[PDB]
Amino acid sequence: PMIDQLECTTNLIDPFVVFERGSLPQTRNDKTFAASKGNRGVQAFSKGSVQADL
Protein backbone atom coordinates (compact mmCIF):
# COMPACT_ATOMS: atom_id res chain seq x y z
CA PRO A 1 0.00 0.00 0.00
CA MET A 2 1.17 3.49 -0.97
CA ILE A 3 -1.56 5.83 0.35
CA ASP A 4 -3.43 5.95 -2.97
CA GLN A 5 -1.44 3.47 -5.08
CA LEU A 6 -1.66 -0.32 -4.77
CA GLU A 7 1.11 -2.46 -6.29
CA CYS A 8 0.22 -6.14 -5.88
CA THR A 9 2.69 -8.76 -7.16
CA THR A 10 2.54 -12.55 -6.94
CA ASN A 11 5.51 -14.90 -7.41
CA LEU A 12 3.50 -17.59 -9.15
CA ILE A 13 5.32 -20.63 -10.53
CA ASP A 14 4.82 -20.93 -14.28
CA PRO A 15 3.91 -24.56 -15.12
CA PHE A 16 4.88 -24.15 -18.79
CA VAL A 17 8.56 -23.85 -17.82
CA VAL A 18 8.50 -27.24 -16.10
CA PHE A 19 6.30 -28.66 -18.87
CA GLU A 20 8.84 -27.57 -21.50
CA ARG A 21 11.89 -28.47 -19.40
CA GLY A 22 11.37 -32.24 -19.22
CA SER A 23 8.69 -33.34 -21.67
CA LEU A 24 8.15 -36.87 -22.93
CA PRO A 25 9.68 -38.90 -24.48
CA GLN A 26 12.32 -39.17 -21.74
CA THR A 27 14.91 -41.77 -20.75
CA ARG A 28 14.39 -43.07 -17.20
CA ASN A 29 16.52 -46.05 -16.10
CA ASP A 30 16.07 -48.92 -18.62
CA LYS A 31 12.52 -47.98 -19.70
CA THR A 32 11.33 -45.19 -22.01
CA PHE A 33 8.33 -43.13 -20.89
CA ALA A 34 6.23 -41.75 -23.74
CA ALA A 35 2.64 -40.77 -24.52
CA SER A 36 -0.34 -43.01 -25.31
CA LYS A 37 -1.78 -44.40 -28.54
CA GLY A 38 -5.46 -44.53 -27.60
CA ASN A 39 -6.95 -43.79 -24.20
CA ARG A 40 -5.94 -40.68 -22.27
CA GLY A 41 -3.18 -41.20 -19.72
CA VAL A 42 0.58 -41.61 -19.50
CA GLN A 43 2.07 -44.95 -20.56
CA ALA A 44 5.45 -46.69 -20.62
CA PHE A 45 7.45 -48.49 -23.31
CA SER A 46 9.42 -51.59 -22.31
CA LYS A 47 12.20 -53.53 -24.03
CA GLY A 48 11.07 -57.06 -23.12
CA SER A 49 8.92 -59.72 -24.75
CA VAL A 50 5.22 -60.55 -24.34
CA GLN A 51 4.43 -63.26 -21.77
CA ALA A 52 0.67 -63.29 -21.18
CA ASP A 53 -2.29 -65.66 -21.49
CA LEU A 54 -5.73 -64.70 -22.80
Binding site: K31, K37, G38, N39, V42, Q43, A44, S46, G48, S49, V50, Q51, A52, D53, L54
Partner: protein, 54 residues
Protein backbone atom coordinates in the same frame (compact mmCIF):
# COMPACT_ATOMS: atom_id res chain seq x y z
CA UNK B 1 -1.15 -36.31 -11.57
CA UNK B 2 0.95 -39.22 -10.33
CA UNK B 3 1.16 -43.00 -10.73
CA UNK B 4 0.80 -45.53 -7.92
CA UNK B 5 0.65 -48.90 -9.74
CA UNK B 6 1.65 -49.50 -13.36
CA UNK B 7 -0.99 -51.74 -14.96
CA UNK B 8 0.15 -53.93 -17.87
CA UNK B 9 -2.29 -52.78 -20.56
CA UNK B 10 -2.45 -54.55 -23.93
CA UNK B 11 -4.38 -52.93 -26.78
CA UNK B 12 -6.17 -55.94 -28.29
CA UNK B 13 -8.70 -55.72 -31.11
CA UNK B 14 -11.42 -58.33 -31.64
CA UNK B 15 -12.57 -59.26 -35.16
CA UNK B 16 -15.87 -61.13 -34.93
CA UNK B 17 -16.83 -64.12 -37.05
CA UNK B 18 -19.17 -62.09 -39.27
CA UNK B 19 -16.64 -59.36 -40.06
CA UNK B 20 -17.12 -56.66 -37.43
CA UNK B 21 -13.94 -55.42 -35.75
CA UNK B 22 -13.99 -54.14 -32.16
CA UNK B 23 -10.88 -52.61 -30.58
CA UNK B 24 -10.63 -52.93 -26.79
CA UNK B 25 -7.93 -53.35 -24.14
CA UNK B 26 -6.99 -55.58 -21.21
CA UNK B 27 -5.15 -54.59 -18.04
CA UNK B 28 -3.76 -56.78 -15.24
CA UNK B 29 -6.81 -59.04 -14.89
CA UNK B 30 -9.78 -56.98 -16.11
CA UNK B 31 -12.68 -58.03 -18.32
CA UNK B 32 -14.70 -56.33 -21.06
CA UNK B 33 -18.01 -56.81 -22.88
CA UNK B 34 -18.31 -57.90 -26.52
CA UNK B 35 -21.08 -59.14 -28.83
CA UNK B 36 -20.14 -62.79 -28.28
CA UNK B 37 -18.76 -63.26 -24.74
CA UNK B 38 -16.09 -61.74 -22.51
CA UNK B 39 -12.31 -61.46 -22.85
CA UNK B 40 -9.93 -61.13 -19.91
CA UNK B 41 -6.23 -61.37 -19.09
CA UNK B 42 -4.93 -64.24 -16.96
CA UNK B 43 -1.25 -63.29 -16.53
CA UNK B 44 0.50 -59.92 -16.61
CA UNK B 45 4.06 -59.14 -17.73
CA UNK B 46 6.92 -57.31 -15.98
CA UNK B 47 5.79 -54.39 -13.81
CA UNK B 48 7.40 -51.10 -12.80
CA UNK B 49 7.48 -50.64 -9.03
CA UNK B 50 8.20 -47.52 -7.01
CA UNK B 51 6.41 -44.60 -8.67
CA UNK B 52 5.19 -42.57 -5.67
CA UNK B 53 8.19 -40.22 -5.96
CA UNK B 54 7.24 -39.11 -9.49
Amino acid sequence: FNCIDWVHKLTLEITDFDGSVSTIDLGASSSRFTNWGSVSLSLDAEGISGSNSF
